[PDB]
Structure 1
Amino acid sequence: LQQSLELKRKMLRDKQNKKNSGQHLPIFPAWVYERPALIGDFTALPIGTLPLASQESAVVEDLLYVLVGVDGRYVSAQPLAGRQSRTFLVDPNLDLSIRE
């Protein structure tokens, strides 16, 4: 997202020099690359101390947010915003039956 800006330009130069039947290949703007806002994956409390039959509803709602890349409420999105994947952290004080 930031580290990729180098590799793109070297690859573009390789194809720009090669083309003798033309000049000037186009590019997409910088905010296509830099922004983690156009991708799907861009206060709090410990979930474990809650009653069980409220914990299930809260954790299920958070997980459904988590699957589509949106940061949770009692699942925190660990820092990235470079390459591919991302990781998430549910609290380790969550009840065992739910946690597994």
Structure 2
Amino acid sequence: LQQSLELKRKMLRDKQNKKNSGQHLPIFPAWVYERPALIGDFTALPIGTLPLASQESAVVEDLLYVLVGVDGRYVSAQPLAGRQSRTFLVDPNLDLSIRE
């Protein structure tokens, strides 16, 4: 996750030495990269006793959050957003047929 700060460092020095025939490339303020800004993802009921029809009816709204990057209520995104792809934490007591 962090290394993009270093890649941008190597890059901008290299854009400078390609543009040794010039000067004054633009750059964004650090808040553009530090703030969560446009990034994706970041007390609930006994769902094991919540019955099978309603259990689907509860899960299907969380997908409508999770499809835009919001941590749902069940089925919530993991830390280590790093590497190259996400993983998610759908619960151990949700019905196996719904989990799959």
Do these two structures clear the TM 0.5 threshold for a shared fold by scoring above it? yes
Displacement of 1:20: 3.2
The aligned counterpart of 1:37 is 37
- Larger strand proportion, structure 1 or 2? 1
Please report the RMSD computed on the Cα atoms of aligned residues, expressed in angstroms: 2.0
Aligned mates of 2:35, 2:81 — CA distance in 1: 9
Deviation string for 1:38-86 (max 9, x for gaps)?
2232333452221112101101111221121111101222113445422
What runs of 5+ residues in structure 1 fail to find an aligned partner?
Answer: none
Q: 1:26 to 1:34 in 2, by over 3 A?
A: same
Aligned mates of 2:97, 2:81 — CA distance in 1: 32
Partner SS for 1:48: coil
TM-score, length basis structure 1: 0.81
1:1-100 aligned at under 5 Å gives the runs 2-82=2-82, 84-100=84-100
Does the Cα contact within 8 Å between 2:42 and 2:79 map onto a contact in 1?
A: no
TM-score, length basis structure 2: 0.81
Does the Cα contact within 8 Å between 1:74 and 1:90 map onto a contact in 2?
A: yes
% identical equivalent positions: 100
What runs of 5+ residues in structure 2 fail to find an aligned partner?
Answer: none
